Ligand binder design. Sequence first.
Ligand code: HEM
Ligand code: HEM
Ligand SMILES: Cc1cc(N)nc(-c2cc(CN3CC(F)(F)C3)cc(F)c2F)c1
Ligand SMILES: Cc1cc(N)nc(-c2cc(CN3CC(F)(F)C3)cc(F)c2F)c1
Ligand SMILES: C[C@H](O)[C@H](O)[C@H]1CNc2nc(N)[nH]c(=O)c2N1
Ligand SMILES: C[C@H](O)[C@H](O)[C@H]1CNc2nc(N)[nH]c(=O)c2N1
Ligand SMILES: [Zn+2]
Lengths: 411, 419
Amino acid sequence: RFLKVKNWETEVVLTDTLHLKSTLETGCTEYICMGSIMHPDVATKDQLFPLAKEFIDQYYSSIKRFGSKAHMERLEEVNKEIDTTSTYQLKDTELIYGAKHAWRNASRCVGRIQWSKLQVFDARDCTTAHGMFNYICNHVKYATNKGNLRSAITIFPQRTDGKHDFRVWNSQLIRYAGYKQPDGSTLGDPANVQFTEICIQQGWKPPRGRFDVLPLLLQANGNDPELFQIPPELVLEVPIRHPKFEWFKDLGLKWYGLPAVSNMLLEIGGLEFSACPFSGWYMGTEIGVRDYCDNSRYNILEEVAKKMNLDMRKTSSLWKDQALVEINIAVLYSFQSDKVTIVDHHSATESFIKHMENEYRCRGGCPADWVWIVPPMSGSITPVFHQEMLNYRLTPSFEYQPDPWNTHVWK
Amino acid sequence: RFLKVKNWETEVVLTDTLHLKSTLETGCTEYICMGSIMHPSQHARRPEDVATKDQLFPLAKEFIDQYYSSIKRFGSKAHMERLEEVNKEIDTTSTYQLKDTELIYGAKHAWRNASRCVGRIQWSKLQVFDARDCTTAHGMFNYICNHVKYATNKGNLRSAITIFPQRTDGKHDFRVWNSQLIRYAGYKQPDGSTLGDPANVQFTEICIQQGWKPPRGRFDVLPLLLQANGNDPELFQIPPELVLEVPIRHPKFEWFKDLGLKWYGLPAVSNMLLEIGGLEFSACPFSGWYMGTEIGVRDYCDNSRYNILEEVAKKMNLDMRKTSSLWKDQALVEINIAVLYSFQSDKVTIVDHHSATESFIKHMENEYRCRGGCPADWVWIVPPMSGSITPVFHQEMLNYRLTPSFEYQPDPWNTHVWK
Ligand code: HEM
Ligand code: HEM
Ligand SMILES: Cc1cc(N)nc(-c2cc(CN3CC(F)(F)C3)cc(F)c2F)c1
Ligand SMILES: Cc1cc(N)nc(-c2cc(CN3CC(F)(F)C3)cc(F)c2F)c1
Ligand SMILES: C[C@H](O)[C@H](O)[C@H]1CNc2nc(N)[nH]c(=O)c2N1
Ligand SMILES: C[C@H](O)[C@H](O)[C@H]1CNc2nc(N)[nH]c(=O)c2N1
Ligand SMILES: [Zn+2]
């Protein structure tokens, strides 16, 4: 009835009761832990009823109206819609609550101290890819806010029969293209080579550079997706320079200011919002460690280390570690110099511990995925490394979903 | 059913069937994951104190079955006699005694099964010192000294475990009260600060309370506190010539030597329990060699350990007023360069986290290839610095509890009734 988590650095112990409210699977079993597995159909009428009730109950409990006339009538109204239309429609208040709580419940998100400050753009009246483009452009402009970034989500119409899904085919709203060259090398972001190819096949004329912002590939109502160029004045980018290394700007590095995940599914009360792009601001390591230094990504450790004149003939010189730090210093300095919101992994992990402890106080727990919360460099010098965490799946939730090109029926 | 793990760098997919042999709960469920809990489970294979026959024999049979299976017997003459022998021993002493071969097999397989250990590519190259004839803390000291000398080997370190008499009723436990054979003292200062290793403040106070005269310095090698057959523990000073230490200097920063840092070369875990076929070896000090990050990241830079980041950073003349300058990250790298440069210059075995994690990936592939799996705890395997530029960060792992195993146990001073 109670689970305890300890911080081995501070000795603080928190008591988790919230996990009793989880209902969906983590992927582990009693005899094997799948904590590091990355990824461990429409609901029928009878399936949807109890999911809707649980969510409406939770909503009315949250606003201290549980058992109220409004709670009871809403429940009856929801059951009526399910009974008649096999689905139902969230009120705006419920939509905002659900979206904020899916963020609040994202066990892999270190930025959740911000969860209650989320701008929710209801796009459930959207019917076409042009409409989605308009909503997404407004999302980008609002979220970017001339560098003073604001978290935001735009929610497109829910799934109906599974054959009319709204999807943003992009994994993120703003990403750079990748082009495989005849000689085996890759220009730009190798993570996006397949998506870049889909875009070109759909008629995108690529600049064939290292930092081409990809076009939006937007699917409405299960139709074939359509290409749209985000207006370049809406795509805020930061050239990456270094406060001490004059030569760093000569690497030609830049990144975009707005991280905007667009390939996940938002599940609220059994309803599935298959297009729900959301955005916050970057933690610097996402760019400096993963985007720039993953071997499968821009992979710049060698080039930076060369320019640092590091001894690269043996690993134990820690040349990779040395270059990695300087790169991440560069990322933070550049965003800060251009007054583009960014958070370093130390600030972000400290805030998440504060958030986590507050969540245990007021909510009874905070589901947290250590594998994802600990930054990908300098792990043990951030406080989350020493923080025991319990992982469990609460709903509303953000879910992975198959890439749309693996399932789309081309018209 | 049958589980796959993917490496997201290489796209290599491995298929795990070994997990079907797991015995103990992980702590996780279908609904909650406890993979970052230090001690998620208290599920043990044998109950409280001296087990009844229907409790110990099934575990014994299982281990003996496993051992005779390993050597292409099972059902052979010697196996069936061994079951009868173990059966008679439990009938007449409420326990049984491992053969030398079984002890060695058991110790190597506890190491092979240690999901949290990144060094297991070496698992079958393990020197086993049978100390089950030991009877006194003096004898334990003699065995541990021999272990330390053998394992240190003038810097060419060698993996070793020394196995003292198994638990009998729980009142006669052999214990090394030290957490590791070689650790530095920690002193609580009058002004509230801490001198030495703050992790060892309590154990240091116990030693001082037991007559240890501390030199009260930053790197005081602690005495051994040895408990034999349940008796009160006894202090022993490890002969310093057996304690190989490495002065930490930096290949570039000439001022780094002035920090006065050293570390010992031999990491030797002494507070764990070795469990083989229901038998519990409560004193089983084992040692290998260091991954540089254990010293340079955790020992030196944990806030509640030596916590040297600020002083190194000051010497480096870094911007320390804001986290976003990454001054901690900058010093952290130089410290770990220094640690590796120092050990290597002194020809003391050490492995950097890049080479270690690379070898562990290879070990995983080997284990899946011949064994059908390898239990691995990502949370512990990924190094505490530069995680994602190491291959294990990108390697999905499956964690499960195979026996024989190394287990945690209570610190004996919470258990011990003195005399
Ligand atoms: C406001 C500042 C935010 C920061 C600093 C932040 C930080 C992060 C980071 C560093 C990750 C890991 C990303 C990766 O490794 O690929 C992450 C994951 C995630 N974030 Fe946040 N985030 C923020 C806002 C948001 C918002 C506004 C939402 C939703 C409305 C959100 C939902 C998620 C989810 C669902 C994941 C996990 C994705 C997955 O499961 O694979 N985050 N966040
Ligand atoms: C030979 C070189 C070895 C290396 C480089 C190595 C490396 C490591 C490292 C880095 C850890 C994590 C330590 C920590 O963060 O506290 C660890 C844990 C562990 N090692 Fe190894 N190890 C080696 C040898 C051995 C041997 C010889 C044994 C036993 C015979 C062993 C058994 C274990 C166990 C049981 C753990 C987990 C401890 C726990 O759960 O608290 N290791 N190892
Ligand atoms: C809102 C937000 C803020 C922030 N700082 N990061 C992210 C963020 C999240 C992901 C995870 N996504 C799930 C997937 F596997 F599909 C990839 C990937 C990124 F690249 C990101 F930038 C998101
Ligand atoms: C044989 C060996 C080689 C090596 N490289 N490291 C270790 C090693 C393991 C631990 C785990 N300890 C048990 C605990 F949970 F208490 C913390 C702690 C250390 F300090 C170590 F050095 C052991
Ligand atoms: C195999 C492992 O689960 C995978 O590499 C994870 C590790 N932790 C991560 N943590 C974050 N934040 N993002 C990631 O992509 C990953 N990848
Ligand atoms: C809370 C968390 O499990 C704890 O800090 C762990 C994290 N991973 C670790 N990994 C290793 N190798 N050693 C450790 O002591 C720890 N500590
Ligand atoms: Zn788990």
